[PDB]
């Protein structure tokens, strides 16, 4: 297993536009399109994003291909944070998969803010953080998802997802 396996198992593929857990525009394997409550607006956005008139529809290829840059993204922008930095380089492999997963998912600036779960984990301080990681909107909106990579960082193996 490994990071895009995991996310491509949460995150699912769809081909056609779609609205995700929050009722947003989003296509492919998570990537979000737009904020916006316009079908439109979010049919321009998918069409700048790959380059070709799509109609709303794209290829398992181009989905592929955002999801690589998404995945790409998600890590460059955890090496780039100050607070996120320390902690990812402070990691295990599994570990640190799970970190980017909720970066992929809440961004940057949302995982920056769970400040006490960082520390914790910095300290390796598994089942503290765990208990802390689920005290969140985050668990209590998408509850399995959040098992699942908690249990990744909680305990550094992939058996949440066998
Ligand atoms: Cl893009
Ligand atoms: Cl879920």
Request: proline content about 2%; charged content about 25%; aromatic content about 8%.
């Amino acid at each position: 297993m490994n990071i895009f396996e995991m996310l491509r198992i949460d995150e699912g593929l769809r081909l056609k536009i779609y609205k995700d857990t929050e009722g947003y525009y989003t296509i492919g394997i998570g990537h979000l399109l737009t904020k916006s409550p316009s079908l439109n607006a979010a049919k321009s956005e998918l069409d700048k994003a790959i380059g070709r008139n799509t109609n709303g529809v794209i290829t398992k290829d181009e989905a592929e291909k955002l999801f690589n840059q998404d995945v790409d993204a998600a890590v460059r922008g955890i090496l780039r944070n100050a607070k996120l930095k320390p902690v990812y380089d402070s990691l295990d492999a599994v570990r640190r998969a799970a970190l980017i997963n909720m970066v992929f998912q809440m961004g940057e600036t949302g995982v920056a803010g769970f400040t006490n779960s960082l520390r914790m984990l910095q300290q390796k301080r598994w089942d503290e953080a765990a208990v802390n990681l689920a005290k969140s909107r985050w668990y209590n909106q998408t509850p399995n998802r959040a098992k699942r990579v908690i249990t990744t960082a909680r305990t550094g193996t992939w058996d949440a997802y066998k």
